[model samples]
Target chain A: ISFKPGNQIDFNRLFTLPVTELFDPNTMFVYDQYVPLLVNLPSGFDQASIRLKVISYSVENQTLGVRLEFKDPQTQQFIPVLSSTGPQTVFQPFNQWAD
Target chain B: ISFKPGNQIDFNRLFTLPVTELFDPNTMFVYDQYVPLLVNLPSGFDQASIRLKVISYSVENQTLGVRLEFKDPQTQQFIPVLNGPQTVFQPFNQWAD
Candidate 1:
C-alpha cells in the first residue's frame, strides 16, 4: 500500500503485512526495510522547525519492533527522532468485521 | 537501537533486526510494528503546512514492504502520506563490516 497526505496511520493500518514479506526463512535472517513518511515543510519552515512526540507505545510477547524517522533536505539523508529501534508495543489482538 | 533527532537513519541501521524479532514462525503470520520518530515542528509550522515525497523505493523477490506516515495535530491521530503499504524494494544483499 501507499501513504498519502493526511491519512490515518494506526496500528491496524501499519501491520497489514505478511511474515513471508519481511522474513527469509531459508536465510534465517531479516532484511532491511524502510517506510519513508514524506513531509513538505511549508514555504518558510525547515527540518529544524518540526518535532515528533511519542503519544503511546508498548511491546510484549513478541520480537518485532517499529520506530519513526525523517529525511534531511540539505543532506538528502534520513534521520531518526528517537532511536534506531524506538518505543515498541506489546502484543494486542485485532479482528475483521462484517458490515 | 534508538532514533534520536538528527540521527542518521539508513537501511543498515533500520534493518538491524533479527528474523525472530519480527517474525513468529509458530504463528506463520505478520505482526504490526511501529517505529515512532519524534519531531519538534517549529511553533509556526502545522500539519497542513507539510507534504511528503517518495525519494526512492522498490519491492521484489520478497513480500515485505514499507511506507511513510504522519500524525494530524488537529485530530491528535496518525496519518499516512501515501498508503497503508507504501513502496517496497527488490532483494538486495548487504554486508557486515
Candidate 2:
C-alpha cells in the first residue's frame, strides 16, 4: 500500500519477514490509516506523543461508536483513553494545529 | 513466531504482505501448527490430505472448552465443524498414532 498502485515495493525492509508464512490476500486490509495512530515516539522528537486521529466517513445519524484503548509498553496491559461516555460529536475537536 | 530464541525472520514471504500492515506481534500465533490443517490439495498424491492435530497439556477439574469452525473457501463463508462441542479429548484422537 505504501507504494503507488503499480510501482515496485522497497525490498530493503521487505526481507525481514520470510515468505514461508501464509498471509491471506483476500481479506480487506485496513492498515494504511490504522498503524500510524498506534505508534509512540521517543521523548525528544521536537515535541512528541501518541496521536490518534479518527475521521468518520459515516453520516452523523448512521455513525457507529468507536473506542481507543491504550496499553503500557512494559506490562502489556489495557488503559482506556476515551471511554464510551457519549456521542463523539458532542466533544469539541482537539485543535492543536502545528505552527 | 517461526524463529525461536529470536534469530531472524525470512523476508521473502514477509515482503509480499506489506509491513505497513500491522500484524500484532504479541498475539498468540497458532500459525506454526494451525495453517497446515486448512489447506486443500490437488488430486493424485500418495497421501495428500488436510491433517489437524491437537496436543493437550491439561488434565482433571478446571478444564477449558474448545470449538472448531470450518469455512467455505470460495464464498468466504463459514461452516461449523463442531458446535459448543464438549470434551474434545472424549472424541477420537485425530492424530491417532
Candidate 3:
C-alpha cells in the first residue's frame, strides 16, 4: 500500500524515503515499506509536514486488508495522524475527524 | 487514534510517540494519534522493532475502517510492508519471509 499527499494538498516540496533506509540494516527485515513525504511552507499557509508509511502489506483478502499512515499540512494536525491497518478513510470536519 | 503493540509480540522494550509531538508546533491539527513501540534484542533473539501508528481515526462506519503499519525483525520483510486503509493483519511464516 502507498499514499500520496492528500489530493487537496499544496506543499512546496516533497520527499519519499524508504523506511528500511531510515532505520536499520542488519536484520534485513523490512520490505516495500516506503514513506511518501509531504512538506508545507510556513507563515500560516497551513505549514504541516506529512508522510505515508506502508509495511507488511498483502491484498489477498478484501475482507481482512492492509494499511498506511497520513499527515496533511492543511488541517495541519488533522486527526493526529491518519494510520490504518486496512481500508480507512477519514475526514477531519468541523465537529470531528470522521474515519 | 491509538494503537497498542501486537498481542503476540515479545519485544524486550518499547516506546509510544505522539505524531504531533514529533514535528511542528503550529497548525494545531493533530489529535489522538500515537505510536505503540516494539523493540527486540539482538544475538538472534529476534532483533526486530515494531510500532503501530494510528491517526485520523474514527469509529462509525467500520466498513472502510482504520489502519496501522507492520515491521517484525523475525519474519523481516513480510508481504512487502503490509498496509491498508483499514483492518489488515499479517504474520510472517515460512514460505514467505
Candidate 4:
C-alpha cells in the first residue's frame, strides 16, 4: 500500500511511501501477528511522529491491512487513521498503486 | 483532495491533509487560474521537499486538479508525481478522514 501526505498539505505536492518497505514480509513473524514500524515524521517532533502496525494478513484471502496511527499535536493523543476500503476500480490489479 | 505519505514509507502510519485548506475557495482567483500553495514537508530538508501547484480548476465540471512535484534525494531532481484517476468511490461525499 502507498501512503501520501494528507490533505493538510497540498495533495498534489506530497511524497508517498510503500507499506512493504517499513514492514518487510521477509521479516514478518509468519502468522497472525502485529508488527510496529516506526518512522520519524517531518510534520512532528520527537515522539510526535507516526506509527504503522501490521494488523493482520490473510494469504488465503489475498489481502493484508495495516493500522495507521499518528500523534495529534493538538490533542497530544495518538489517533487512529482511517482509509477508504470501498469499491475499487476494475483496473486495480493493473495499477501498481491500487494493487 | 487528500495528500498522504507515499509507499516508500509506511502507508498506515501517516496523517492526511485536505486540499481545500491549502487552496481555499474563498481566496480563489475566480476563474481559470492556478494557485500555488507552499507548505513545509517533514520528509525532506530545504528545497528537498515538495511542491504542488494548482494547475487548473473547473467549477462547471466540478473538477479541480494540481501538479504534484517533489525532489528525489537520490537523483537530486524534482519529479512530477503521478496519481491514478481511473475511478473513484461512489460514497466519496459521505466519508471524512
- In lDDT terms, which candidate is top? 4
Residue B87 C-alpha lDDT in model 1: 39
Q: Please give, for residues B39-81, the per-residue lDDT of candidate 2 as tens digits.
A: 2211221111111223221233212222323333334443333
Model 3 residue runs over 4 Å out of place are: A1-99, B1-48, B59-66, B72-84, B88-97
Q: How many backbone clashes does candidate 1 have?
A: 58
Question: DockQ: which candidate is best?
Answer: 4
lDDT of each: 0.34, 0.27, 0.26, 0.37
Which regions of candidate 2 deviate over 4 angstroms? Answer: A1-61, A82-84, A87-99, B1-97
| Segments of candidate 1 deviating more than 4 angstroms | A1-99, B1-15, B18-63, B90-97
User: What ranges in model 4 sit over 4 Å off?
Assistant: A1-43, A46-99, B1-48, B60-63, B83-97
lDDT of 4 by residue, B1-49 (tens): 9989765764324532333443545533212221212332333233324
Better of 1 and 4 by DockQ: 4
How well does candidate 3 match the true structure, expressed as C-alpha RMSD? 23.2
Residue A68, model 1: lDDT of 37
Between prediction 2 and prediction 3, which has the larger TM-score?
Answer: 2
User: What TM-score does candidate 4 get on C-alpha atoms?
Assistant: 0.27
User: At residue A34, what lDDT does model 4 achieve?
Assistant: 15
Give a tens-digit lDDT track for model 3, residues A25-93: 442222322211111123333112322332332222111111333345466452424334433332111
Candidate 2 interface RMSD to the true structure: 23.6
DockQ of each: 0.03, 0.02, 0.02, 0.06
